[PDB]
Design a protein around this nucleic acid. Structure first.
Lengths: 59, 62
DNA sequence: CGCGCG
DNA sequence: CGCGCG
């Protein structure tokens, strides 16, 4: 479905960008593209950051 | 001339040079983006040709 | 190496 | 907004 729901499913299943990226490919693109979506949701209040590497979780 | 030669020439003409300073000098003396300049500046930093002196940081010969 | 950057 | 990154 939409990238936000696929990322939400990855977190439900603190998850990193690499974890989220691997969940989407193995269940359903490049590091830059996924990062843009992750930071767009962070700007909108859907996600929260917890570093190096970037760990993501649902707000 | 090579990027190292253009960058050095930009640094000497400064009256301590910023990336935009080096970029503007090159673009009006030879008319040759941000990633390509920073690639060379930070490479010449690694080889000891240049030194940093902040945000975005100023460049100078070593 | 965190990088998403326009 | 520092970004050079591969």
């Amino acid at each position: 479905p939409t990238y936000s729901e696929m990322i939400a499913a990855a977190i439900r299943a603190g998850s990193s960008r690499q974890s989220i990226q691997a969940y989407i490919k193995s269940h359903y693109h490049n590091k830059k593209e996924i990062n843009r979506v992750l930071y767009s949701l962070l700007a909108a209040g859907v996600l929260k950051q917890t570093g190096v590497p970037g760990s993501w979780a649902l707000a």
